[PDB]
Each structure stands twice: as structure tokens, then as C-alpha cells.
Amino acid sequence: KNKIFSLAETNKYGMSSKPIAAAFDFTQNLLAIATVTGEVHIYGQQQVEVVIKLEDRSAIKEMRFVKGIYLVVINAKDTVYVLSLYSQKVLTTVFVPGKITSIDTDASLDWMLIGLQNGSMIVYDIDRDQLSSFKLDNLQKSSFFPAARLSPIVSIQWNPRDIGTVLISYEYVTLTYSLVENEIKQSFIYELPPFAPGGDFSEKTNEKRTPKVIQSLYHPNSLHIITIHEDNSLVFWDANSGHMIMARTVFETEINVPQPDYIRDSSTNAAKISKVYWMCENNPEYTSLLISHKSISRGDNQSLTMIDLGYTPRYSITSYEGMKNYYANPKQMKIFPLPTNVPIVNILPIPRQSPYFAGCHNPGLILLILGNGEIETMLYPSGIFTDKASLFPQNLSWLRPLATTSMAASVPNKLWLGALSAAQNKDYLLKGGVRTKRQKLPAEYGTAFITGHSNGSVRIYDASHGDIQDNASFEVNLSRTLNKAKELAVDKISFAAETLELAVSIETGDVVLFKYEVNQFFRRFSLNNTNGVLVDVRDRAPTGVRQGFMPSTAVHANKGKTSAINNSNIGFVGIAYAAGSLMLIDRRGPAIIYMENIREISGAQSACVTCIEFVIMEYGDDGYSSILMVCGTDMGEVITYKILPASGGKFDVQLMDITNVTSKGPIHKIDAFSKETKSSCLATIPKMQNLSKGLCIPGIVLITGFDDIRLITLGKSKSTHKGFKYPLAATGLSYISTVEKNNDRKNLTVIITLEINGHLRVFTIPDFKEQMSEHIPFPIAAKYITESSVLRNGDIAIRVSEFQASLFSTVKEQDTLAPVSDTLYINGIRIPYRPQVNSLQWARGTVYCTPAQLNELLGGVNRPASKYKESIIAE
Ligand code: NA
Asked: Distance (Å, rounded) from C-alpha 491 to C-alpha 565?
């Protein structure tokens, strides 16, 4: 019935599953993130975002960006997809014959190199979707170690300065292969003499050992290589000579010379090296190594290590001992701790200068994807962790950090638009992409999303994609307000939209109050300095903000965690604590106007207040309206108070009564509506000013229980009840207008009920006749079903996964335009010239190979023209 209703999904926020991989394109300046279900999300400037779903739901291992128009995606099943930034759909799927171990791709090259578990090397033509005839067998088994087990290729790396040389590394040996000459140029083998200490994790020091290589890299000058070995040795070799310059550790040097009386002098438990990256600064002559360390036990053992080697000495005029000094005495060294003990799973440097040098040229920020799906950012080389939501598109802000609670608010646009006008995001990181303008028809009411994270930060933005709403967001830091560093998890938060006020309650029970206002433009701050519960925090506002959500007062009650917070639209703040405390704050002041325990007033065993609501209507049979406060208790009781206007503009509190409404506690959602007009009865400033008129507005209050809804009337015994099959997670009163006759604006007030299992109904009032009975299309996390908010205009916002939210609209007829995807590829961007071997460093010894020359070797003289428009486009 009521065909004006149909469940329609309007917006999605965040990512649908756990991030598992990442990649970045400097040429187009786009950032791609891969989920475990095979989704690829490409983000750009402001709020550019394109979602591509691969045919299989398998996980993603690696990506690279090719030519600035291609995105190569490799899954767990060793299937390689090619995606386009111009046509924005899957271009090619390839089933590569073998188990892939090492991949390399260059910015200006149309080929990608694949090593296998069986040791063979193969080359794939991304531009033309063909396998090339160039194939190399297992070189270690073929030339050096015939009797060894079949060694997989540990690492393949294109030379940073010459596409004609490829660094290949096997388990017990590494080498440099030339594609032009089809031969092995130089080979290095790491062997330890007896009694050699080896690395930290060396085993059986007495006997001769040949540890497996775990990773090899080229130096930015391309004349030096590093081999990390399973003992955590770090051996620096010279690519051309075959000489072993040194073997060092992160802490000690010369680990290869035997030492009969060696003793491990380390007060820190040794950490297995996970991966090593060789980053370079603006001048490639300035380089540093970042090493990630595998965790032992479970405690914070994933820390980064940076070795800034500074100016690399000139190659031609320094001996091997000079390189030994240069690598053995680092220019600077520092360890970057990780704020969490969650293991690191992927590290992606974000280049700022150019996409060469393995995508690690002058990285200003390092994106770390952890095992729990988080995304962290390290400023480099400073090492400062940043979680500012303005660095990345708002969809990424659901990952950095994890959003502990979320809510949506129906804000009147009258001042909301003026607020978002000067709240534009101006310091995003991604620069590419051109955002499609999706103009929304103007409306009286808009929607805001508000999220609180475990960091102690609250992010607020608009849920529409309009001209102003799209790139506008506020961020408030609870840490700077309280001068605190730990125990900052946000638990609950309440938003008064009519005057733009906020109350944020954290795991320690502290509640901080924020208000929208202009700016007033110490290091010993603490909540324990003074004795009063209300602590002044006005002067602790962020420096550079001219106007925004600033803190006014912090609440340090020392009474425990909070069970209910509500910030009214008329200056009142209601705070309830798990111990039983109930506390009323007048923002006029500031002042406390009521502070009492509710276990000494209840007739039941009700421990704490779970919901606080403000209404302005007639109590009982008083014949006139006043300021009334309704609270629900965890045992199904309801306590109604009056806030009487007292002398001097202050306010008293008079307890009217407490009645056991239902046995199905807790009481978590309170709403109200007038009996005749059926408009919202919740308190507002104009309604408060209207009290002098002597007006009387008898009303009915909807109280939500565990799985029942009660229609009750203040000051009376009669009530009505409705029961559900499953417990109710989110509800609200929605006031919608329907036109049926000719232009008649017939308003209809209905209640939107959502159960934790995902079912949604829409009933009328007060008869509670069903108008919708549908389900949310996808299953929802029972942990996060309850963080839903019902909006004024029939919309319902549900948290569905740990990282994603969904804003549904329950009005079938909505001014919906055809979906428009955004533009990723912008033509005319030039890829900088690939760096070549400097003649002043190593004269001769090189055979210059142009890209077309390499195409002729790998694909043949008769290489077919591509079937893609991108190949012609990307030139
Ligand atoms: Na937006």
C-alpha cells in the first residue's frame, strides 16, 4: 500500500570491505585501493571517486599504474586484469600460467615482468594483451646450484636507469640479466664463513650457511644493490663489479667476518625484516631506507626504521672501502614507532616528484594498510603520524582511524549552507580528476553525517553531493581540548542541528561540549587542575580556524562511563552515567542545574538513564505548555521533569514523576508529536519563546524499548503498545508532504522502524498501520546496525559494515537524476623522461635501449596494433 513509499538506496560512504592493497599514479595523480573482495576504488581531488568491481570476488595482491592510463590488478588466483582510466571498465583478463611471486612495471613501459614459483620469467604485453616469447628458465638451477631445490624468483626489478637490465634474485643467488643481449651480466652469491655471526636470526653459526634472500633492490643511481637475507643480514653489492662492499645489520656492522667469541649485545628482541624500500629525495643523490619489521609475540613489534644515507659519494672516484664507510656510518638513523600493535600488511609510499624509482621518488606521505583494514599515514622523513580527515576524500575518513560511532542529523539549511560555505576543504592530497557537478534541487532541510573515531576525533560533513555540500567538512580534535594522548575512544555523541551544537562522550565518561562560533583571533592543561566538574576549554581552540565548531566546557565528573547524552536546541545538555548520575547543564552560564542519582528515586531496579529528550507541551492536565524533560531508564521506566524559568534568567528543575512504562528496556529513542496538528513536539528556541502565549499542545510521545514501541502521554496512565518480532535498532518521526488532488500539500507523519536483522517497516501514527514492509538489500553488522539515524525527510542512514555507511531514502518519488560517473583520465599530461645512467658516474659499459627497441625485442618486429583506444590516447 501507499505507493508513495519505496525503499531506495541513495548514497554509500567508505569502502564495502577490508582494504588489502594500494597503488598510486603521479601522472594522473590518482590513488587506487584494493579490497579483499576484489573492488578497486580510485580517488582524486575533492571528492572524485570511481568504483570498479572485478568479475571475481577474490582478494587482490598487487597493482601498478601503466602509462598513466592503465591499472594492472593481480589477484590471489594468479589472474591479471587490466583497467582503463579513460573508459573506466575492465579491459582484459589473463590467466597467467603459473604461481606468481614477483612483478615489476615501469611508468613508460607497456610490458610487465612476472616471476613464478617454478623459476621461469615471463613478460606480459599490457598495451596489446599478448604474452611475449621472451622466457627465462630457472637460472640458479641451470648454472649455479643444480642439486638445490627449485628456487622461486625472490625479486624482479627493472633498472631505475636502463630498461635493458633487469635485477633478478633467487633464493641463494642474485644476478643481473640483459634483455638486449639475452645473457647474464653479473652474479652475486652471499656465503658466510664458519663462525660468522651472520644476521640477528642466524642459526647454526658454527657451520657454513647460505641464507635465502628475501628482497633485493636497486640504488637510485642503479650502480649498487641490496640483498636482505633470512638471517636479517643487509649486504650491499656493486652491480657491475661483483664485489661485496659490506654486510651490515640495522644495528651492527661487518656480520660476515667470523668471530669465535661473538656475543649478541642487543637489549631489544630481534625483529624479522618484513620488507625494505629505498626512497629518494628531490635530488636522487639523497636517499634513505625504510625497513618494516615482522612482529614477534603480539606487542607493537611492527616498527619502521629509517636510514638516511645522505649524499652518495661519486662512483668513479671512491674505492670499495669508501662505499663501506658510506654504508657503515649512516648520515642519520631513526626508528618510527607504530601507534598500534596491529601488524602491517601493505606499505605504499606516495611520490610527489615523479613515478619512477619504483614509485618512491620524494614521498611526502606513506600509506600503511594494516591487518584490521586501517589506513595510516606517516609524514616523511619527519615520522609524524597524521589522521587529519582533510588529507583524503571523505570516503577514506571511515578508515583513518576506525569510526567508533556514527550518526546523521537533519539540519535546517538556513544557517547550514552559510556554515558550509566557508568550511570548504582546501588542503586535500590528491590533485587529479575533475569532479562532475551534480546539482541538487534546493530544500529547506539538509542531512549531515557525524562520525567519532577511536583517535578522539569527530568528523562532520554533508551527505548531499551539491555545489557546496560536496567539499565541505568540519573536524574537531578531542585530544587538543583535553590535553590528553590516550583513552580517547569516542563512545556517544549528540547533535543539536537548529543551533549547531555538539556533545561528545568518550570511554572514560568525559563529555566535551562544542558550539559553532567565530574564533578568539597552555602546555600544562589537565582536567585535574581544578575541583569543579565543569572545566573551561574555550582558549584551547585550534589556532588557524576563523570560525567553526569550538569547545566551550569539558565535563570531568569522575563518575564513570556515560549511558546517555543529549544536547538540546535551547541550551540544555543532558548527561547520564552508568552509576546512576543524571546531570543537566545550562550552556547559558555555563552552569549545572541538576545533579542527582536516579537509583534513589526509582521504584524499580533501574540503574541509569539510556535516553534523554526535550519536549515543550502540556504535562498531564495543566492546560498550558512548558519546558519538559523526558528520560528513559535501563529498566523501562520514564522520568519526567519540568525546567521552570527561575529568577535572573536561571532555571530550576522539578521532578514530576517516574512511571514504569514497559518491561522491555532499555529505552534508547524518545520522540513526540502533537495530538491534533501531528507536528514535531521537540523543544526549539521559537517554541520556547511561544510559551508566554498560554498555548496548550497536548501530545503523544513515542518511547522505544528493546523490541516494542509505546505511545504514552505525559501525566496520564493510558498508553498503547506495538510489538516486533526482532529487536528495534533505529527509529524516528519523519514528516513528509504528498501532493494528490491538484496541488494540495497534504503532510503525512509516519514512523520508520528498523530492526537489527535489517528489516524495515513504515507505520502511520497513532494507528500504527503498516505502509512499508521491506528489507535492506544487504545483510548488516549487528554491531553497527544500531548506529543508525532516522532523518526528518524520511531518510534512514545505517552503518552496514565496519568501514561503510549507507544513506537510504524512503520516499519513492524523489528528484533522482541518472547516475553519473566521474572523469579520471585528463588528456595532455606528460610523463617525465625516465632517468638514465649518468655518464659522469659510470662511463661506458651501457647499451642505450629506447622503448621501441625493447618492444621490438620482447614482442617482435611484427607486433600487432592494440585493440584499445587508450594506446593511441596515451601518447
Ligand atoms: Na558530501
From this structure: 10
- The answer to whether 548 touches 423, Cβ cutoff 8 Å, is yes
What's the 374 CA to ligand 1 centre distance in angstroms? 22
Are residues 42 and 50 in contact, defined by beta-carbon separation less than 8 angstroms? yes
* Closest by CA position to 619, among listed 720, 744, 755, 713: 713
Q: Are 438 and 817 in contact (CB under 8 A)?
A: yes
Centre of ligand 1 from the C-alpha of residue 113, in Å: 41
- CA triple 540-571-411, angle to 5 deg: 90
Experimental technique used to determine this entry: cryo-EM
Which residue, 522, 503, 381, 506, is CA-closest to 456? 506
For residue 245, how far is its CA from the centre of ligand 1 (angstroms)? 55
For residue 396, the CA-to-ligand 1 centroid distance in Å is: 13
Under 8 Å between Cβ of 787 and 799:
yes
What's the CA gap between 373 and 21, in Å, rounded? 10
Supply angle C-alpha 52, 390, 49, rounded to 5.
Answer: 15
Residue at grid coordinates 568501514: 803
How would you list the strands of the sheet with 19-25, edge to edge?
A: 19-25, 30-35, 39-43, 49-53
Centroid of ligand 1 to alpha carbon of 13 (angstroms) = 9
Cα of 462 from ligand 1 centre, angstroms: 5
| Gap from CA of 441 to ligand 1 centroid (Å) | 15
Strand partners, 644: 652
What is the distance between the alpha carbons of residues 787 and 729, in angstroms, rounded to a whole number?
8
Phi-psi region of 359 (alpha: psi -120 to 50; beta: other; left: phi over 0): left
User: Which element (helix H / strand E) includes 322?
Assistant: helix 320-328
How much distance in Å is there from the Cα of 477 to the middle of ligand 1?
20
Distance, in Å, from the CA atom of 411 to the CA atom of 636, rounded to the nearest integer, reads 30
Cell readout for 773 is 514492509
Residue 872: strand, helix, or coil? helix
Residue 689 burial (CB count, 10 A) = 10
Q: How far apart, in Å, are the Cα atoms of 519 and each of 34, 456, 476? A: 41, 22, 14
Q: Cα of 535 to ligand 1 centre, how many Å?
A: 34
- What's the gap in Å between 819 CA and the centre of ligand 1? 16
H or E segment and range at residue 81: strand 79-84
**Which of 22, 67, 16, 66 minimizes the C-alpha distance to 43?**
22
Asked whether the CA dihedral 494, 785, 388, 47 is positive or negative, the reply is negative
Query: Ligand 1 centre and the CA of 39: distance in Å?
Result: 22
Closest CA to 777 of 821, 808, 820: 808
The Cα–Cα gap between 242 and 239 comes to 6
Closest CA to 633 of 612, 657, 654, 655: 612
Centre of ligand 1 from the C-alpha of residue 447, in Å: 10
Ligand 1 centroid to Cα of residue 469, in Å, is 5
* b/e sequence 507-538, b meaning 16+ C-beta within 10 Å: bbbbbbbbbbeeeeeeeebebeeeeebbbebe
Ligand 1 centroid – CA 471 distance (Å): 6
Alpha carbon 107 to its chain's center: 27
Centre of ligand 1 to C-alpha 460, Å, is 10
Going from the Cα of 48 to the center of ligand 1, the distance in angstroms, rounded, reads 11
- For residue 191, which phi and psi values (nearest 5 degrees)? -125, 140
Give the Cβ contact number of residue 155 at 10 Å.
21
